[PDB]
């Protein structure tokens, strides 16, 4: 009944559904042809077909409804949008548009939408009355994003220690420093699982730029939520196009008072793609960086905020450091003072194969009093006076064994004193 529903429908049932109408030789045809044939079998008979997609506007008022499972890639299955649809209902990039799909006209290879039934998971008359995200008033992160799973496993301790190292709240524009071979991938999956566990209501999203497909498949199954990525073989134009429209989806949910969490890996690659896409300004930076190239990621990264009116937008990007590229240091420096949170994976402890390997002394955050309680920050203040005077390699080994024995971090906070 729904075009997107037929996409996930198993091919075994697709032939049976098509053959019930009276189709033929569906087994030999491709799955897309079977889906298109069912669209053809209802276009002639006048039967309405449902569907939905994410708006992807263009320069002439026309747009397409890209699919999340398609990584927002252009294709025949995308629902074409017309400039008239903007006149009927105010249209913005990243909008979730749902409605009955009309048959295409002559010369159109994409099925058009006769009318819109739902906008951003809500009625068009009510979704058009939402205040813009840019006109909102940002506020400091106050609602702490609890991450402690409490399972007692080794990976459970990882979520516990990140709360102790640098607390993360809703709308906190975080940032992490990743030296090569620091196990950054494992912690992100562990963090995402706790995100879906602790806060199933939030729209947890994962964005991967210039990443190998093996981790892309791993992210989709491990993360209990929508996962989008751009292949490492894709050109830089795809990387900037994917990332720009991802935040458009995130912003509309913020306009609908929905908490959004975006995991980015890596902002260094995203900045590198943006540098190669924009035209040269004539003034270059050290390491071969365009002057106005840094402006684009700032808008993307700077949007992460805890909106005072309602909802939040959290972006946790990954900074590539000590990777041997001169472009990596300049990107990190340009974003050094941008994020409200900093985490530094310890490569020295990584060579010791101790996971997680976090530089507790170097890592930290600002305005953590809002996230912490009256006594929560006091306990970690004592821990600050303990780990900092000594080395972090031995301290990380010390807390890992003690955190396993302790059930809760509050209970864990008591055992060092006694």
Burial of 287 per CB tally in 10 Å (0-12, 13-18, 19+) = middle
User: In whole angstroms, what is the distance from residue 136 CA to residue 254 CA?
Assistant: 10
- Identify which range of 147-155, 157-165, 300-308, 390-398 contacts a second copy by CB under 8 A: 300-308
Size of the site for a second copy (CB under 8 A): 68
How are the residues of the chain apportioned to helix, strand and coil, as percentages rounded to the nearest 5? 40, 20, 40
The reply, when asked if residue 174 is annotated as ligand binding, is: yes
Which pairing describes strands 79-81 and 96-98: parallel, antiparallel, or unpaired?
unpaired
For position 375 contacting a second copy by CB under 8 A, the verdict is no
Nearer to a second copy, 149 or 305 (CB): 305
For position 322 contacting a second copy by CB under 8 A, the verdict is no
The reply, when asked if residue 326 is annotated as ligand binding, is: no
For position 353 contacting a second copy by CB under 8 A, the verdict is yes
Nearer to a second copy, 102 or 362 (CB): 362
The reply, when asked if residue 181 is annotated as ligand binding, is: yes
**Considering just the CA atoms, what is the radius of gyration of the chain in Å?**
24
For position 131 contacting a second copy by CB under 8 A, the verdict is yes
The reply, when asked if residue 186 is annotated as ligand binding, is: yes
The reply, when asked if residue 185 is annotated as ligand binding, is: yes
Nearer to ligand ME7, 87 or 298 (CB): 87
Residue from the set 48, 333, 397, 410 that interacts with a second copy by CB under 8 A? 333
Min dist CB 408 to a second copy, Å, is: 26
- Residue number of the CB closest to ligand ME7 reads 84
DSSP helix/strand/coil, 355: coil
Which pairing describes strands 63-66 and 52-57: parallel, antiparallel, or unpaired?
antiparallel
Question: Tokens 């006149």 correspond to what residue?
Answer: 87
Please, which residues have CB within 8 angstroms of residue 330's CB and are 6 or more apart in sequence? Answer: 285, 286, 287, 289
For position 381 contacting a second copy by CB under 8 A, the verdict is yes
115 interacts with, out of ligand ME7, a second copy, none, CB within 5 to 8 A per kind: none
Say how many C-beta atoms besides its own lie within 10 A of residue 408's C-beta. Answer: 12
For position 378 contacting a second copy by CB under 8 A, the verdict is no
Q: What is the DSSP letter of 131?
A: P
Min dist CB 213 to a second copy, Å, is: 5
Min dist CB 305 to a second copy, Å, is: 6
User: In whole angstroms, what is the distance from residue 377 CA to residue 263 CA?
Assistant: 26
Task: Supply 230's token pair.
Answer: 């751009």
Binding site for ligand ME7 (CB under 6 A): 82-84, 87
List, in sequence order, every residue forming a beta bridge with 52; answer none if it has no partner.
98
Chain-centre distance for alpha carbon 189: 12
**Footprint of a second copy on 199-218 (CB under 8 A):** 212-214, 216-218
Residue from the set 22, 44, 60, 134 that interacts with a second copy by CB under 8 A? 134
For position 22 contacting a second copy by CB under 8 A, the verdict is no
Question: Tokens 């019930």 correspond to what residue?
Answer: 20
Q: What is the DSSP letter of 130?
A: P
* b/e per residue 299-322 (b: at least 16 CB within 10 A): ebbebbbbbeeebbbbbbbbbbbe
For the annotated binding site, the residues are: 169-174, 181-186, 212
Binding site for a second copy (CB under 8 A): 10-13, 15, 25, 27-31, 90, 92, 128-132, 134-135, 137-140, 173, 180-181, 212-214, 216-218, 231-233, 235-236, 276, 279-280, 283, 285-286, 288, 291-292, 295, 298-299, 302-303, 305-306, 323-325, 333, 336-338, 340, 351, 353, 366-367, 381, 388
For the annotated binding site for ATP, the residues are: 169-174, 181-186, 212
């Amino acid at each position: 009944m729904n075009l997107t529903e037929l996409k996930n429908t198993p091919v075994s049932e697709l032939i049976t559904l098509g053959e019930n109408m009276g189709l033929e030789n569906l087994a030999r045809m491709r799955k897309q042809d079977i889906i298109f044939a069912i669209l053809k079998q209802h276009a002639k008979s006048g039967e309405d077909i449902f569907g939905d997609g994410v708006l992807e506007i263009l320069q002439d008022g026309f747009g397409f409804l890209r699919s999340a499972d398609s990584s927002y890639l252009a294709g025949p299955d995308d629902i074409y949008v017309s400039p008239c649809q903007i006149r009927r209902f105010n249209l913005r990039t990243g909008d979730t548009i749902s409605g009955k799909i009309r048959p295409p006209k002559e010369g159109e290879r994409y099925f058009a939408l006769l009318k819109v039934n739902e906008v951003n998971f809500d009625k068009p008359e009510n979704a058009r009355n939402k205040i813009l995200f840019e006109n909102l008033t940002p506020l400091h992160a106050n609602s702490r994003l609890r991450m402690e799973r409490g399972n007692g496993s080794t990976e459970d301790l990882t979520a516990r220690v990140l709360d102790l190292a640098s607390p993360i709240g809703r709308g906190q524009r975080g940032l992490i420093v990743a030296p090569p071979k620091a196990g950054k991938t494992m912690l992100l999956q562990n963090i995402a699982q706790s995100i879906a566990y602790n806060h199933p209501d939030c729209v947890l999203m994962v964005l991967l730029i210039d990443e190998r497909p093996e981790e892309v498949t791993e992210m989709q199954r491990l993360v209990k939520g929508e996962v989008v990525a751009s292949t490492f073989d894709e050109p830089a134009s795809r990387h900037v196009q994917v990332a720009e429209m991802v935040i458009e989806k995130a912003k509309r949910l913020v306009e609908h008072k929905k908490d959004v969490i975006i995991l980015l890996d890596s902002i260094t690659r995203l900045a590198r793609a943006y540098n190669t896409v924009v035209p040269a300004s004539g003034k270059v930076l050290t390491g071969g960086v365009d002057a106005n190239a840094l402006h684009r990621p700032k808008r993307f990264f700077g949007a992460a905020r805890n909106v005072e009116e309602g909802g939040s937008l959290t972006i946790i990007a990954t900074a590539l450091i000590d990777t041997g590229s001169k472009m990596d240091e300049v990107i990190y420096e340009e974003f050094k003072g941008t994020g409200n949170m900093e985490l530094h994976l310890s490569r020295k402890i990584a060579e010791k194969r101790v996971f997680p390997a976090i530089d507790y002394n170097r890592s930290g955050t600002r305005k953590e009093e809002l996230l912490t309680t009256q006594e929560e920050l006091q306990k970690m203040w004592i821990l600050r006076k303990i780990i900092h005077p000594m080395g972090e390699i031995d301290a990380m080994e010390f807390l890992i064994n003690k955190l396993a024995c302790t059930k809760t971090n509050d209970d864990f906070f008591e055992m060092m004193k006694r």
